[PDB]
Amino acid sequence: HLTRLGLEFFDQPAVPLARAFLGQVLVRRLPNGTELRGRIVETEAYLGPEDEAAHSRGGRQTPRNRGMFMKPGTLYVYIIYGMYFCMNISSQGDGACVLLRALEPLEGLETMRQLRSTVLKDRELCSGPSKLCQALAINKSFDQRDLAQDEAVWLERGPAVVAAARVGVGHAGEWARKPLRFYVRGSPWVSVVDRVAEQ
Template structure:
């Protein structure tokens, strides 16, 4: 696999040991709908609704910025849909002193498992390293690159499938994020702009102080790391393009499995051709 510099994308690569598993049929990659799991009521026995706002005019509590934790069923979506649904949601990490760091997700990538040549779970491989990709949807998968950097993924519906969190728009705790980032930079380096704090998978893990200690945790009930309801991103505002740093993945290197919010300055790498086509 060809890896880019750790400040950019580092995708879940191939695992090392294998265990035969049934290969999945890959879902259609183009024009996949952006599905949100909506809860219009807080009553325990009322099932979640997937209706549109036109069908359900009452605004979902997922889009009211009330710091509402996303529940377990939100993550139980196919990988591509979940990657799109993450856009606009808020990732939160609570530090030991109680400080909460928040960032809005603006860029993601899907790794479909099975036939996906760029996935750690390619061919159904299951290892000690990638086992989180096979756990319940919403499980955190953190892996290390170059021995010092970390990348955070979230398991989705589908065997061995997960979404890489690529970039965040920092919302809360920016001074602390900057301190964490500066701890890994040369003392004479230029001061970081807000847009540079979390614009890459290893950068966002540095800024939020996320490491392998958070691997295999469940976002729906973990006390230190979770996701909250954010803003709804419409399909026309989502750019779909090729993933980065997976040049050895053959035809999979060109599939449009990276998603980001069009026009957002916190995105790591823009694809102007894909933007024009969108």
């Protein structure tokens, strides 16, 4: 609470926000009062209407993705492949948000392991957008919550960034190629390294 990043932090455009997320710690307070912690090491920016890789492309706006259009810091959690969740945080700009792709586990590792068992090496706990949601017990109920004012989840300030193309956007179009994915260089917790982009 005293460390929780507030409203002013989130009110930034997608790219600066996605880059600013690196190093920050995502915290999840479970019912047993225990708190799980993960330092963000990989994120992706979705610019909005012009961004053909975003759900909000062409100004598309529905009840499912309303979060992207809500105040910065508002969560947009959705179900993919009818089996996994993806956690995004609305940024400045309607239809713009930041997807979280990987965290470096810091605390509550044992609970995460249990959560993701449905023996896992720590490297398999949060190395992915859906894995991290599973590891932190994030689900559809976290959709549209305010990361700056929620009792169960918040971001804390943390004490070389690689910019690469996003994952699972395809190999067609200028937007699929744009370097809108950012992660901690040399980090062993990133979900997908891009040796090419690192050079």
